[PDB]
Scaffold this active site. Structure first.
Site, mmCIF file in Angstrom:
data_model
loop_
_atom_site.group_PDB
_atom_site.id
_atom_site.type_symbol
_atom_site.label_atom_id
_atom_site.label_comp_id
_atom_site.label_asym_id
_atom_site.label_seq_id
_atom_site.Cartn_x
_atom_site.Cartn_y
_atom_site.Cartn_z
ATOM 1 N N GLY A 16 0.783 -1.350 0.033
ATOM 2 C CA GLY A 16 0.050 0.256 0.100
ATOM 3 C C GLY A 16 0.793 1.343 -0.115
ATOM 4 O O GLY A 16 1.789 1.263 0.173
ATOM 5 N N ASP A 126 -0.166 9.094 17.220
ATOM 6 C CA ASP A 126 -0.968 8.514 15.848
ATOM 7 C C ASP A 126 -1.702 7.284 16.182
ATOM 8 O O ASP A 126 -1.581 6.402 15.242
ATOM 9 C CB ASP A 126 -0.258 8.722 14.633
ATOM 10 C CG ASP A 126 -0.684 8.754 13.373
ATOM 11 O OD1 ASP A 126 -1.899 9.348 13.227
ATOM 12 O OD2 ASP A 126 0.032 8.549 12.600
HETATM 13 C C1 LIG Z 1 2.977 2.247 7.972
HETATM 14 C C2 LIG Z 1 1.835 1.102 8.183
HETATM 15 C C3 LIG Z 1 0.622 1.197 7.331
HETATM 16 C C4 LIG Z 1 1.335 1.544 9.676
HETATM 17 N N1 LIG Z 1 2.405 -0.161 8.303
HETATM 18 C C5 LIG Z 1 3.446 -0.828 9.039
HETATM 19 O O1 LIG Z 1 4.089 -0.212 9.814
HETATM 20 C C6 LIG Z 1 3.757 -2.014 8.914
HETATM 21 C C7 LIG Z 1 4.715 -2.827 9.556
HETATM 22 N N2 LIG Z 1 4.590 -4.294 9.105
HETATM 23 C C8 LIG Z 1 3.643 -4.492 8.264
HETATM 24 N N3 LIG Z 1 3.090 -5.437 7.736
HETATM 25 C C9 LIG Z 1 2.050 -5.401 6.698
HETATM 26 C C10 LIG Z 1 1.244 -4.101 6.669
HETATM 27 C C11 LIG Z 1 0.125 -4.202 5.504
HETATM 28 N N4 LIG Z 1 -0.590 -5.198 5.071
HETATM 29 C C12 LIG Z 1 -1.326 -4.670 4.315
HETATM 30 N N5 LIG Z 1 -1.396 -3.275 4.343
HETATM 31 C C13 LIG Z 1 -0.134 -2.850 5.054
HETATM 32 C C14 LIG Z 1 0.029 -1.477 5.039
HETATM 33 C C15 LIG Z 1 -0.310 -0.640 4.041
HETATM 34 C C16 LIG Z 1 -1.777 -1.044 3.612
HETATM 35 C C17 LIG Z 1 -2.217 -2.458 3.418
HETATM 36 N N6 LIG Z 1 1.830 -2.783 7.154
HETATM 37 C C18 LIG Z 1 3.024 -3.141 7.953
#
Ligand SMILES: CC(C)(C)NC(=O)c1c[nH]c2ncc(-c3ncn4c3CCCC4)nc12
Length: 266
Positions: A16, A126
């Site tokens: 994403g 946040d």
């Molecule tokens: C910055 C944010 C978004 C808090 N993400 C993280 O810190 C993450 C750390 N490990 C992760 N693993 C999967 C996803 C994931 N899996 C599906 N999606 C995501 C994050 C992006 C949208 C869809 N996002 C993160």
């Protein structure tokens, strides 16, 4: 902390993008095993990524996303553990059959993470359902420490918008503390029991602030236990001193979770 680009293999599709930049999936060759990771891809902007990394380097808790490390290559990259089920808000919209007790279990875990963050005197700044990641259906972890700050030794607040997650005093006085993270946690609870609905739907920032000023609060989500709604409302206590800290919130959650666990055994 500094990782080797040649040991990281990135998938070309991204998980994403948005406000937070870009997240890609990859894997990283560890000492022996290979680890699936999620990688956040990025001049004062270099410094903000480093500063987030600096924060995560200091945290070690079961309910906080672990930083594998950072790497300067094509872009600065922050490499984190992978959460296969993804952000909690997107998951609950897709999974409406998720039971009441499971949702209590997940937000309790978030409160355990936050109690630890409060004890470490970091403010998250946040805290929202979109920043809670699901490793399993039964295991949530907090992420996105992009706005997080280490508190000064002499004060319990940081002095500086996702207005919808902010306590009055953040709006009025730019003051961010563990107590304002507790306000934010109330709204996160509201999101969780509303299966990932956005809070204050159809309202502008200015109208939310006006609503809060008159002592009005979001109502009880359909099917949300009264005890959980009563806890959300306690989180949204106007006065910062009387608003509970995370120890108190976590204890309330823990005890209710044991209650529902006991009812399900009956
Ligand atoms: C910055 C944010 C978004 C808090 N993400 C993280 O810190 C993450 C750390 N490990 C992760 N693993 C999967 C996803 C994931 N899996 C599906 N999606 C995501 C994050 C992006 C949208 C869809 N996002 C993160």
């Amino acid at each position: 902390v500094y990782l080797d680009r040649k040991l990281l293999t990135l998938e070309d599709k991204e998980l994403g993008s948005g406000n937070f930049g870009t997240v890609k999936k990859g894997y990283y060759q560890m000492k022996k095993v290979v680890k699936t990771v999620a990688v956040k891809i990025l001049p004062a902007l270099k410094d903000e990524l480093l500063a987030e990394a600096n924060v995560m380097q200091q945290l070690d808790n079961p309910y906080i996303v672990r930083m594998i490390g950072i790497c300067e290559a094509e872009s600065w990259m922050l490499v984190m553990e992978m959460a296969e089920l993804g952000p909690l808000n997107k998951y609950l919209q897709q999974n409406r059959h998720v039971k009441d007790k499971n949702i209590i279990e997940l937000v309790h875990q978030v409160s355990m993470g936050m109690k630890y963050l409060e004890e470490s005197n970091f403010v998250h700044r946040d805290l929202a359902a979109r920043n809670v990641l699901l490793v399993t259906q039964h295991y949530a972890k907090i992420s996105d420490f992009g706005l997080s700050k280490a508190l000064r030794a002499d004060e319990n607040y940081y002095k500086a918008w996702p207005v919808k997650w902010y306590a009055p005093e953040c709006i009025n006085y730019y003051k961010f503390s563990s107590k304002s993270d507790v306000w934010s946690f109330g709204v996160l609870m509201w999101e969780a029991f509303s299966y990932g609905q956005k809070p204050y739907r159809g309202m502008k920032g200015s109208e939310v602030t006006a609503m809060l000023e008159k002592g009005e609060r979001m109502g009880c989500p359909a099917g949300c236990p009264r005890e959980m709604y009563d806890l959300m409302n306690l989180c949204w206590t106007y006065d910062v001193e009387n608003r509970p800290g995370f120890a108190a919130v976590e204890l309330r959650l823990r005890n209710y979770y044991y209650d529902v666990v006991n009812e399900g055994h009956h």
